[PDB]
Amino acid sequence: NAAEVIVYEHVNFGGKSFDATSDQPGAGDNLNDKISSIKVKSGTWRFYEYINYGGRYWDLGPGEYSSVESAGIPDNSISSFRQI
Ligand SMILES: [Ca+2]
Ligand SMILES: [Ca+2]
Numbered sequence: 001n002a003a004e005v006i007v008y009e010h011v012n013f014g015g016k017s018f019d020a021t022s023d024q025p026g027a028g029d030n031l032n033d034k035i036s037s038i039k040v041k042s043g044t045w046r047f048y049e050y051i052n053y054g055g056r057y058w059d060l061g062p063g064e065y066s067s068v069e070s071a072g073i074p075d076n077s078i079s080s081f082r083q084i
Contacts, residue, residue, distance in 0.1 A: 003043025003083045005060075011036045011067045011075075023082035025052050035078040038065045047073060047081040059084060 002021060007028060009015025014037070018028035026032055032051065040062050049055035058073045065071045068078070 001042050003045070004041040005043070005045045005081070006039040006041065007031055007035045007078070007081075008037040008039075009034050013037045013039065013066070020081070025080045025082075027051070027079050027081060032079050033076050036068055036075055038068060038071070040064075043083050045081055046084045047078045049074075049077050049079060051079045053080050053082060055079075 004021050006017055006019045008017045016031060018031050020028060040060050042062060044059055044061045046057050046059050048057045058071060060071050069075055
C-alpha cells in the first residue's frame with residue numbers, strides 16, 4: 001500500500017505518463033509544466049507550481065482526477081510533487 005501516484009500529460013489520462021512511488025522535485029520524466037490528469041493510487045501527495053517544491057501547492061488524496069483543474073490546480077503548471 002506504499003504511496004503511489006501516476007501523472008499524465010493530457011486530460012483523461014492521455015499522453016506521456018509517469019508512475020511515481022518516490023518524491024519528484026522536477027515533476028517526473030519530462031512532465032514539468034504538462035500535467036493535466038492524475039491518479040493517486042495511495043497516500044496523499046502535494047503538488048507544487050515550481051520545481052524543488054516552490055510556489056503554491058495543492059494536496060490530493062486517493063482518487064482520480066481526469067482534469068487537474070477539478071483538483072483546483074491550473075493546467076500545465078505542476079513542476080514538482082512529493083508525498084506528505
Ligand atoms: Ca497538458
Ligand atoms: Ca510550473
